[PDB]
């Protein structure tokens, strides 16, 4: 499919940025997670980034560490995640769905088989957090064989060689890291380096989404103004889940309010 390409074309037509929330699949349980995701979409999410619970999420700060732990407490497995993904796609045909994976979960049962399952359930992209471009070959090849976009990370200090590699090898979107370190709303990143955004465009990279530490509308607006196609927010969303575990109704209300505000910031 061409879900990201179609989304970006439509957003471009409207002089609009993308707002893309991240959540952990099955946090705090399968049924609530499904309702969370439907709420994010109804409130204006343009695409989703969805984490499969992993025992050792070494690119994630405490907020998302705790999301993984909550999903495990609910007995969430990769198999159940794929079941969830199939249902999400069945409800929502056009929204781009990206997975946030760690390498072992992709490699476990065979790399090719992993990407084939992604294709079967209608996933659009996979970002494997602990696979740098240097190690990416079997992952990106399997992704492309199964019509999945492999997502690559462009760090703030990316040199020319890395920009060219990320531009050539990636599809769907280019992940523009706002800063070093791990995920977390407590740590704000920088303005998208204009130099990086411009070089990526020069090299015909997939459109850039800025992520890490994006927790406020002002940051979404700034990302788009700097020339990114949009922004990803994870910890700020997951914190609302964490805060409202005891009240599913208040949880959904606050998620809706937050996503609405963040999406509003992306509009022309």
């Amino acid at each position: 499919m061409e879900r990201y390409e179609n989304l970006f074309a439509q957003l471009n037509d409207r002089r609009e940025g993308a707002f893309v929330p991240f959540v952990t699949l099955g946090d705090p349980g399968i049924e609530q997670s499904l309702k969370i995701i439907d709420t994010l979409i109804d409130a204006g999410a343009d695409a989703l980034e969805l984490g499969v619970p992993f025992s050792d999420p070494l690119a994630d700060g405490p907020t998302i560490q705790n999301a993984n732990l909550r999903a495990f407490a609910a007995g969430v497995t990769p198999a159940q995640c794929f079941e969830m993904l199939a249902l999400i796609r069945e409800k929502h045909p056009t929204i781009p769905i990206g997975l946030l994976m760690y390498a072992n979960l992709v490699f476990n049962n065979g790399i090719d088989a992993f990407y084939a399952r992604c294709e079967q359930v209608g996933v659009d992209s996979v970002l494997v957090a602990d696979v740098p471009v240097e190690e990416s070959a079997p992952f990106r090849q399997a992704a492309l064989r199964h019509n999945i976009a492999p997502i690559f990370i462009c760090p703030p200090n990316a040199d020319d060689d890395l920009l060219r590699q990320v531009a050539s090898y990636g599809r769907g979107y280019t992940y523009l890291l706002s800063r070093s370190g791990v995920t977390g709303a407590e740590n704000r990143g920088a303005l998208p380096l204009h130099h990086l955004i411009e070089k990526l465009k020069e090299y015909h990279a997939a459109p850039a989404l800025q992520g890490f530490g994006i927790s406020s509308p002002e940051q979404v607006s700034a990302a788009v103004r700097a020339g990114a196609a949009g922004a990803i927010s994870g910890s700020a969303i997951v914190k609302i889940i964490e805060k409202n575990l005891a009240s599913p109704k208040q949880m959904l209300a606050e998620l809706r309010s937050f996503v609405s505000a963040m999406k509003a910031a992306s509009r022309a």
Partner: peptide, 23 residues
């Protein structure tokens, strides 16, 4: 790109987030 071989046969490598590759 590295100065030395990161692999011992099929084993080894540099499976870290992109941010850590310069380190």
């Amino acid at each position: 790109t590295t100065l030395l071989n990161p692999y011992f046969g099929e084993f080894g490598g540099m499976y870290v987030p992109q941010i850590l590759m310069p380190a």
